[PDB]
Design a protein around this ligand. Structure first.
Ligand SMILES: Nc1ncnc2c1ncn2[C@@H]1O[C@H](COP(=O)(O)OP(=O)(O)OP(=O)(O)O)[C@@H](O)[C@H]1O
Ligand SMILES: Nc1ncnc2c1ncn2[C@@H]1O[C@H](COP(=O)(O)OP(=O)(O)OP(=O)(O)O)[C@@H](O)[C@H]1O
Ligand SMILES: Nc1ncnc2c1ncn2[C@@H]1O[C@H](COP(=O)(O)OP(=O)(O)OP(=O)(O)O)[C@@H](O)[C@H]1O
Ligand SMILES: Nc1ncnc2c1ncn2[C@@H]1O[C@H](COP(=O)(O)OP(=O)(O)OP(=O)(O)O)[C@@H](O)[C@H]1O
Lengths: 449, 449
């Protein structure tokens, strides 16, 4: 970790022209200008995000070397400091897949029956990046008029056929478009198809020879195990920001309530193999939400748990020493309680950091500037709210839209002169990064309104 | 009364796992975060209720165990911290009954002849829950046309009859629908009258057998004393939040002016039996209000007196040491005097408290958040203003509406972690409850505008 004075003096000696390094070290002087974060929050006002700025630094790297690696919980790590919020208006299994493919995570909302949430988790854990998730397969006992309508029900129309479930051939639109006819098309006589477990490059080369649209994957027992459709192999992108677990399949989380009736919901989700739980609660520091934490850590010692909403170091203490591995730092964005967001994030992050429990800055983030700030104050990850609602993956497109935010954060953390979010926060806690307040007159000019 | 550190450490030892109780007591450490109330008002910015928040605490009880018992004056106590304001657009005998049935009190306005206010008090003191207050009795000498029109005057039409006023029979629409006679209607024959005063639950059984619409209440003198109507027995609710005096009938108050002409108004109201007087005045600390106070305490030593409006500890001193038993803490919510309401409530409550003289936070309260605040700052009761105008009791129904505010206050004082308003204030004065300021940027984002 090199100070801006160390970076300038070293890189100036790399460019080329004594008792300067020997009389003040690599700290070759810089003017003190603006406030350190510890001073900015000392006046005890409710500084929100619109209210402060980050004074620019020294730049010695390009805007595409700003490592974004962030930490979600004590053991889960992410390539992107973003998250989708556990709301019915935002996250379901489609957006949970989309976020994980962009190096983040998503949390499945809990405004549903417990079985539905476990099904939506299962739907994410089994994604495979080119195979069809949960293929529809039909029985020869069923009349093809009740396969022809499925095109009116699900929209797709090339259906594989077998005795009841995941062998005979396929029925597709070209078997039906000239005609109710019981079922009388394509026995087990398909062309070149995947005989066992296969790769996506191998399927791309087989589909090129075969020219057909569906490709079964069968097993050694010579029955269907998965299926491919050509239309997806035409488009499936590279995703280096993978967000995969130790079994090389997507990370995803689930929200759970804190009620007595929720040990059952938490079972079904842990049987679906969910990676992390967020305890959804308007105020996390309650006796029965601490009982819920002690209960999870006693029964499923592998499951990561993120504590419910807090905004003080006293709440953060009681949830941490209960054993939680994260924290949603956000509340009050009519109520009579809460805290101004910017002060909440700074105070909880600075407290949690003493043990290593990264936090999650949820609430009232609505620009990429607010994201860069929340990350400079101490938040480890920012939970995108209704900002993602009315994108086409919500119950623009998330896959095309997340790169915009990434490039914006990278440009920001480049103007600040911090080559990786971990360094941004180190540069903040050590007082090397400087901040300035704003009068209302100075934000009505150049922003806000 | 136990602190968040005492409650967490004790309740953790109820669940189970040393020289940690023996080296710092039940105060097992919590982070200092936010301002105590004494610090919040030290800056001498005049705050109002929109300017601060209450940092959330530790929760260990349900939102329905938040005892709301508050103290109106040194001797009158209320089950609910609400009041209806003494305004013509708000309080009259109907709303005064409605507030007392919801565990609060109401103060009858004084924009009237003194006789009218004494009548509206008399109407409130004599309520009796099931019985008709002030029944209409007609004379056997009246022609039916002057009874039949009363249905056009008062709307009801089952009129009991006797010589002039509070039985010799009844007359109802069924006696009159076919017709003008002068007397042909039901003479004394009535199906199980109440022979004396009776329990409302006994009358509920009598109406079930009798099937008639009216039930006379009579006396051993063989004459009327009260009457019951069947339609009210179908709907009378439980009211456990009673607000009743030692004589087991409703509490109510009256506003009086401070003029020389008002010893007469104060007589008529004290003859009607009013429980508490509020001295209405734009500024309470005047020689002729202190004369009015000394005068009441010299002539009616039983009557509770609430001092007219103040906003400083210097005003509060002069009225307290005059002998008043309460205080409307509110002024100026264009006139060149006054105070920002949040600072007024805190300063007057903190001063009065030295003697035990609870105050009443009147002015500019327009949400349930502001109510929870005014109660956290020191106000003992909050006087609902034009917030209650355009309800059906205003000269959408107060009986149905007050439970909303109650549940809201209870949810608030649950998030704050204080099991009973008396504990909320104890937790504030002892500096355990922490507050935060809010820049305009922090309330332009999180509600309010
Ligand atoms: N067996 C299947 N079960 C469920 N969905 C399927 C199946 N086969 C294809 N799909 C859906 O179709 C998408 C891509 O294939 P495509 O749309 O070309 O199917 P298709 O059957 O060939 O459609 P169509 O016959 O109308 O042209 C997949 O991403 C998936 O959403
Ligand atoms: N892997 C396969 N091997 C052999 N024949 C196949 C295979 N997959 C599909 N078929 C058959 O080949 C024909 C074309 O099917 P295809 O996969 O192209 O779907 P389709 O409905 O015809 O697609 P599209 O509507 O876009 O033209 C159909 O008779 C179908 O049953
Ligand atoms: N004798 C009465 N004197 C005064 N008020 C009365 C009297 N009888 C009824 N009321 C008023 O009328 C309300 C409804 O009473 P009730 O339903 O018995 O009316 P009613 O006599 O049957 O009228 P109607 O014959 O027109 O239906 C009561 O709550 C009360 O406010
Ligand atoms: N307590 C009573 N005992 C005996 N007769 C009564 C009594 N009260 C009313 N009546 C008579 O019984 C008849 C019906 O009276 P009731 O009170 O049921 O009519 P109402 O409810 O006022 O009229 P409506 O049915 O239109 O609302 C009338 O002749 C009335 O004078």
């Amino acid at each position: 970790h090199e100070t801006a004075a160390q970076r300038y003096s070293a890189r100036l000696l790399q460019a080329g022209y004594m008792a300067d390094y020997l009389i003040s070290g690599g700290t070759g002087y810089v003017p003190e200008d603006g406030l350190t974060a510890q001073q900015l929050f000392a006046s005890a006002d409710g500084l929100t995000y619109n209210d402060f700025l980050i004074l620019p630094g020294f730049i010695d790297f390009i805007a595409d070397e700003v490592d974004l690696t962030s930490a979600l919980t004590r053991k889960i790590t992410l390539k992107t400091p973003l998250i989708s919020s556990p709301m019915d208006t935002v996250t379901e299994a489609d957006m949970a897949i989309a976020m994980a493919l962009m190096g983040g995570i998503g949390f499945i909302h809990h405004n549903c029956t417990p079985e539905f949430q476990a099904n939506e988790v299962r739907k994410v854990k089994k994604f495979e990046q080119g195979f069809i998730t949960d293929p529809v397969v039909l029985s020869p006992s069923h009349t093809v008029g009740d396969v022809l309508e499925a095109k009116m029900r699900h929209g797709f129309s090339g259906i594989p056929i077998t005795e009841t479930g995941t062998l005979v051939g396929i029925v597709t639109s070209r078997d039906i478009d000239f005609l109710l006819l019981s079922e009388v098309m394509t026995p087990r006589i398909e062309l070149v198809v995947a005989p066992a477990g296969v790769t996506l490059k191998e399927a791309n080369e087989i589909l090129q020879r075969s020219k057909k649209g569906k490709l079964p994957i069968v097993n050694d027992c010579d029955e269907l195990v998965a299926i491919i459709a050509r239309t997806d192999l035409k488009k499936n992108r590279d995703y280096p920001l993978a967000s995969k677990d130790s079994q090389k399949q997507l990370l995803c989380g689930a929200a759970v309530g804190t009620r007595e009736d929720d040990k059952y919901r938490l079972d079904l989700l842990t049987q679906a193999g969910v990676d992390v739980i967020v305890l959804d609660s308007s105020q996390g520091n309650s006796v029965y939400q601490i009982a819920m934490v002690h209960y999870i850590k006693q029964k499923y010692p592998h499951l990561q748990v993120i504590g419910g909403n807090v905004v003080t170091a006293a709440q953060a203490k009681n949830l941490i020493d209960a054993g939680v591995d994260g924290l949603r730092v956000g509340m009050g964005c009519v109520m009579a309680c809460g805290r101004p967001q910017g002060t909440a994030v700074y105070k909880v992050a600075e407290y949690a950091r003493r043990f290593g429990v990264p936090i999650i800055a949820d609430g009232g983030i609505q620009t990429v500037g607010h994201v860069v700030k929340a990350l400079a104050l101490g938040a480890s990850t920012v939970m995108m709210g209704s900002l993602l609602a009315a994108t086409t993956e919500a119950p623009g497109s998330i896959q095309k839209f997340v790169p915009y935010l990434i490039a914006g954060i990278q440009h920001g953390c480049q103007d600040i002169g911090a080559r990786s979010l971990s360094v941004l926060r180190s540069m903040m806690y050590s007082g090397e990064l400087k901040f300035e307040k704003r009068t209302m007159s100075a934000q009505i000019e150049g922003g806000v309104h």
